[PDB]
Design a protein around this ligand. Structure first.
Ligand SMILES: [K+]
Ligand SMILES: [Mg+2]
Ligand SMILES: [Mg+2]
Ligand SMILES: [Mg+2]
Ligand SMILES: [Mg+2]
Ligand SMILES: [Mg+2]
Ligand SMILES: [Mg+2]
Ligand SMILES: [Mg+2]
Ligand SMILES: [Mg+2]
Ligand SMILES: [Mg+2]
Ligand code: NA
Lengths: 59, 110, 117, 134, 194
RNA sequence: GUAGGGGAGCGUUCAGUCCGCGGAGAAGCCAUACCGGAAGGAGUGGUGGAGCCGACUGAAGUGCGGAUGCCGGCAUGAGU
RNA sequence: CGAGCUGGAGAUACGCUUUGACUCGGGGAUGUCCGAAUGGGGAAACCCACCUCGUAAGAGGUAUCCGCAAGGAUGGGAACUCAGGGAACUGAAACAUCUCAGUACCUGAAGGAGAAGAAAGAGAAUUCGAUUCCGUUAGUAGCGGCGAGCGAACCCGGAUCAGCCCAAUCAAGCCGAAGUGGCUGGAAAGCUACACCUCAGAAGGUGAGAGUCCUGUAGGCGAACGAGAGGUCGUUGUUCGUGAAACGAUGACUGAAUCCGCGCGGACCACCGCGCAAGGCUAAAUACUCCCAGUGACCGAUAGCGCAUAGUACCGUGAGGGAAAGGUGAAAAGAACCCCGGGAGGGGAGUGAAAGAGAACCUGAAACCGUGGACUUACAAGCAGUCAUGGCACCUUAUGCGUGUUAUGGCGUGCCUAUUGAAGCAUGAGCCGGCGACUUAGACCUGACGUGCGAGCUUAAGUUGAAAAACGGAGGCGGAGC
């Protein structure tokens, strides 16, 4: 899907998922301190395969 | 079912040309050509003789017996031979009647 | 390039069918059944190889204790009588002796006693 | 000869056949017969549920011309904008960018479309002049 | 290093490929060629659609001992085929460089055995053919092994009627295949050569 | 040792190439106690009356016991 | 064209033919009735008229829609083209959008093609410059309950390439080089010893396997003469589903200018840039294929079109559905005559190489039935075997290794599937033969292996050549990431 090219799986030099954090951003929040300020990166070594098979070609 | 279509439906002889028989049976045996059929490539020559028996059940006095008749052949004949042996003839000319051509080999007698 | 299965199945089959020699009924004449018969047979041919030994050994044993009792002993005493002395180590074929040559087997019995008590 | 001509050893292995099994059954035992729409994508498995909106732009992508390509080897063929094609930078449709990576001071002239801070301060530092379009 | 028979006499020209002729290499080539010669032909009603057959048969439940739908499925006689032959092409493009190496090595195989060249085809004297064979005789070409002539020039081909003897090849039109098909080879023309 | 994965090969049709066989006779079928580790192959005989083995390589419409499979033929229920 | 012909048609009779029969080509002269059917009616192949020309026979006209007229049209076409109208199953692991898809189907119209076409364009270079098709761009931009999933264009290569005009050689066909003997055989074109042609060794026939016997093939010749505006509202297309949503199009309401003019350039405005509608026509590249030729790592008849001819038998009221079936032999010399019999059928004789080819005739498997012989069996309970031993019989892979058969003992819960678990009193199966199930396509993605280049690596379309192949570097992947 084209909603994948704009999904947090960028084709990095190596070939893994360039994730982020889905804890809480837009709604349902207001507690904790810097829980929302967790707008960093994320990575996984068990789904890189069944995710890159949809965006690999159009890197 | 084909039958003489392999050839072009043209016989290289007539119904009165002395012809010999090469290969098969009756080797070297010459005879006068009687009935010639360009379709089924059939050739009746007084040479090959076959004693057949006509079936006449009630023609009146059938007296069924074994008559003397001839049998037809295929392309196992060398038409027109003048050196006493099988020849071939494609050369052509004209005599007094330029409306018809002729045939020859190494001699010119057909 | 189509490829028929001609001449291939028949042969396959005849190969099986010809194995059936003494097979009763359709086992010897029909394939689906003759072939099926063999599977069970395979289970027999192999297991029988291993089992036949259990049969003959058993056979030889009866002859041995039959000839023993003939004099006044028994298989348990006789075989052991050859063990007490590393001398005799026959065991196999020994059954043939107690059957063809009773004289030769008589000495082995007497020797069993002289190395026991 | 033409009949002695063999094969690579491993140039092409035999196909795989699921018939004549003698103990072979194709696929999974159940719920796998003559259907192919399951896929391996969808949108209820990680695909969706990822917090990403971003913004697609794709403006101008410049051609990375490594500095060692100019320096090191070569007798200076004059980069210009045509002769450089033979220097293994054939791209077209996009402009040209000059980035410093190889280091061997040498005096060479450079005519690329655009160039970096460190690039320009590495060419004229050893001789040359980085020409940019007016 | 083959010396010309009619006209000049060199042969030192051209470089033969290393290693000394590899069978594998020619293999990939001949296969590709035969592959482009295989015409797409397939007379099979793979589809159950192309066949003239209705859509409904008996009933699904209650006919007793049936369970069928169309009489055009592969489980039925005179119907369609399962996975039949469909018309295709099978004509890829083998890498040019390797093709260039094909004949470069192909010729190679004849330089180590039967190799023959000639510039000047005057001995021929028109069609004749009879004289053509005479010329072969006086050149080792007895007429036992198959020969491939690869020269231009209309008359020169003109006289070449025979089977196991020689073969026609207009305008240096080589194959890896044709050269390996016949035994002896006659490059003759120095057009493609050198 | 099942699902499964891996490895080495047999057989069939078509094709290129090679050595060939065939009227004193091929293929096919039929009998068999030989051979190979299997798939299989060979010798001989009988039949038959025109074509077809082996080796290497390529290409699939390639290997049956089953699906209340399909087609055809022929049985049992019975002399009921 | 040069001897036969008298259709597929097996047979008889009468005949047609050097005043060139037939056949193969090319134009005419006759074409009943039905069918768009058109004189009317009509349940098609029937019935009934009238008028006119006339020796009665007989011939001609009489339909409707445009036109003074000439003339043209209402018809039928397998597929392909355009237009009008326009589904659902399915997908979305349900389902209202979207997909499916503007596909199938329906209808109208036309051709050997159509469609489209000479800028109120594309687009960003102050550029290309009719249309269509192919490759590429690229699966990018974009679209989408932002889900499924759908999906351009410009630049460039290539096929083919023109813009003019209104209103104010293929079909007949002929000619066409080059063998004799001997032997096996019933019959050779094979074996054998020699010879010859070859711009012809493609191929088929000829008793069998073929250059030189036949027809043809290379090549040459070849005719009377036959072809070649804007806006609003409701909506839609293009990637665009109402999103900031342009533009094109259309129904309904309204309604501008035209030279210091008008439209457009993803609301809008200025600037800038391109182009100038409300008229038309127009080769070629392109699609498909009833038909024809050629070809085949296409079948060889349970294949292949359904059909080795048949939309026939047969089924249904109808629409419609829809089979199976090949082979005597080189050629009929296909069986006089005799024996049994009503016949059928069979046996002799004869023909032939063969009758062990006999006309419900190539080969002749299996299931099934039967005859004969050998070895056995009428007190034992048997998944129908296996092992061992004995008796008997036979000795072509084989007098000594076993084969065939049996008596007896020991042992022994069909196969497949589906299952925690099957001999299962769970499922499937009368038997046998045949047919039958992991494939194919997309320069797709990824990996192993192999191979030719190697910091480079290849081309797609296409063109020119094809008993063979090269050319073609638009483009893609390497190369810098974030
Ligand atoms: K044999
Ligand atoms: Mg299953
Ligand atoms: Mg889920
Ligand atoms: Mg039942
Ligand atoms: Mg009763
Ligand atoms: Mg259609
Ligand atoms: Mg069991
Ligand atoms: Mg039971
Ligand atoms: Mg059961
Ligand atoms: Mg059940
Ligand atoms: Na229509």
């Amino acid at each position: 899907t084209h909603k994948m090219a704009k999904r947090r799986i960028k084709i990095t030099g190596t070939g893994k998922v360039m994730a982020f954090k889905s804890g809480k951003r837009h709604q349902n929040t207001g507690k904790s301190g810097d829980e929302i300020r967790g707008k960093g990166k994320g990575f996984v070594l068990a789904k890189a395969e069944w995710a890159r098979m949809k965006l690999m070609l159009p890197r | 079912p084909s039958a003489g279509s392999h050839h072009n439906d043209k016989l290289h002889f007539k119904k009165g040309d002395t012809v010999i028989v090469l290969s098969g049976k009756h080797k070297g045996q010459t005879g006068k050509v009687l009935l010639a059929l360009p379709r089924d490539q059939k050739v009746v020559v007084e040479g090959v003789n076959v004693i057949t028996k006509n079936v006449k059940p009630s023609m009146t006095n059938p007296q069924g017996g074994q008559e003397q008749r001839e049998l037809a052949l295929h392309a196992s004949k060398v038409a027109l031979v003048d050196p006493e042996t099988g020849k071939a003839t494609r050369v052509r000319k004209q005599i007094v009647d330029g409306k018809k051509v002729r045939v020859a080999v190494a001699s010119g007698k057909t | 390039p189509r490829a028929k299965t001609g001449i291939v199945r028949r042969r396959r089959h005849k190969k099986v069918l010809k194995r059936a020699k003494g097979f009763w009924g359709s086992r010897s004449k029909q394939y689906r059944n003759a072939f099926q018969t063999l599977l069970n047979a395979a289970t027999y041919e192999y297991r029988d190889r291993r089992n036949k030994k259990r049969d003959f050994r058993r056979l030889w044993i009866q002859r041995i204790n039959a000839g023993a009792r003939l004099h006044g002993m028994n298989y348990s005493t006789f075989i052991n009588g050859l063990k007490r002395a590393n001398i005799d180590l026959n065991r196999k074929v020994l059954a043939d002796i107690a059957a063809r040559e009773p004289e030769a087997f008589k000495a082995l019995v007497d020797a069993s006693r002289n190395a026991r008590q | 000869g033409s009949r002695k001509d063999r094969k690579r050893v491993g140039r092409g292995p035999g196909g795989t056949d699921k018939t004549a099994g003698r103990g072979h059954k194709g696929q999974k035992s159940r719920s796998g017969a003559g259907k192919g729409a399951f896929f391996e994508g969808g949108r209820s498995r990680l695909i969706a549920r990822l917090p990403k909106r971003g913004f697609n732009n794709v403006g101008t992508t410049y051609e990375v011309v490594k500095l060692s390509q100019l320096q090191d080897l070569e007798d200076t063929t004059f980069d210009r904008d045509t002769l450089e094609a033979y220097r293994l930078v054939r791209r077209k449709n996009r402009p040209v960018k000059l980035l410093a990576s190889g280091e061997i001071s040498r005096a060479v002239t450079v005519h690329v479309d655009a160039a970096s801070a460190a690039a320009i301060k590495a060419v004229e530092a050893a001789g040359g002049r980085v020409v940019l379009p007016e | 290093a083959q010396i010309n028979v009619i006209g000049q006499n060199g042969g030192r020209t051209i470089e033969l490929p290393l290693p000394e002729v590899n069978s594998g290499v020619l293999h990939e080539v001949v296969t590709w060629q035969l592959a482009s010669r295989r015409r797409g032909t397939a007379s099979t009603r793979t589809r159950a659609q192309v066949s003239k057959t209705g859509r409904k048969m008996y009933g699904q439940k209650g006919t007793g001992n049936a369970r069928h739908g169309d009489r055009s499925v592969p489980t039925f006689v005179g119907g369609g085929v399962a996975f039949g032959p469909k018309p295709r092409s099978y004509d890829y493009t083998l890498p040019r460089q390797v093709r260039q190496l094909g004949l470069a090595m192909a010729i190679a195989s004849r330089q180590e055995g039967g190799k023959l060249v000639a510039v000047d085809g005057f001995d021929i004297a028109d069609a004749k053919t009879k004289n053509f064979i005479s010329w072969a005789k006086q050149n080792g070409l007895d007429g036992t092994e198959k020969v491939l002539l690869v020269t231009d020039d209309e008359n020169t081909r003109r006289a070449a009627r025979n089977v196991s003897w020689v073969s026609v090849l207009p305008v240096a039109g080589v194959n890896v295949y044709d050269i390996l098909r016949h035994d002896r080879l006659v490059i003759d023309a120095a057009a493609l050569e050198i």
